[PDB]
Amino acid sequence: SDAPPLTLEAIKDRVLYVLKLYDKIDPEKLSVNSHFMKDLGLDSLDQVEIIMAMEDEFGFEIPDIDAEKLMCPQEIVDYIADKKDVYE
């Protein structure tokens, strides 16, 4: 158990990298507080695809009930940290 603990800085970096690899959001427009619907022009299906990208990047499952409220990368990071039990 000598592996370094996961930190919200690393969480944000990973989430932003998966956003960058998503080909419908250009890197120059996305921010941690950007909103999927109006700030980026995405509908529900792109949001679902982003959620599955999160699921297979962070190696766990996200129920649909709480997956429909994550609308910005910041609260995605919040949800990951809450399910991950990190401090900083």
């Binding site: 529900s44 299906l45 679902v48 695809e49 599955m52 649909d64 429909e68």
Partner: protein, 115 residues
């Protein structure tokens, strides 16, 4: 008025949730379908075709119709996963042999009498 018996969903939100679940399942399955059937398409265009087939019915505003569509889509997914379809059934979604049909007024005038 006009009280009707539900199929699965009491309103539009439950139907949308079922639609999202079905879409997630199809999106997960597409790469397995591409590999297992030895198709000549990419995963990207397979998922694009899935998205197009979902968007074909995006105008429906009736929960009974929506969850009947979801039942049919689940039937199709079960047919694909269990490899009950052949490669021909999977490839029928793309119409690679059908000749392109012009939507222009002049072209349809030239070819025949069909509007």
């Amino acid at each position: 008025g006009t009280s009707v018996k539900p199929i699965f969903s009491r309103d539009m939100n439950e139907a949308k949730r079922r639609v999202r679940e079905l879409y997630r399942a199809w999106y997960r399955e597409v790469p397995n379908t591409v590999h297992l059937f030895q198709l000549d398409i990419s995963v990207k265009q397979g998922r694009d075709k899935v998205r197009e087939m979902f968007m074909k019915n995006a105008h429906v505003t009736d929960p009974r119709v929506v969850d009947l569509l979801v039942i049919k889509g689940k039937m199709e997914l079960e047919e694909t996963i269990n490899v009950w379809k052949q490669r021909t059934h999977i490839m029928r979604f793309f119409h690679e042999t059908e000749a392109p049909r012009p939507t222009d007024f002049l072209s349809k005038f030239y070819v025949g009498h069909d509007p």
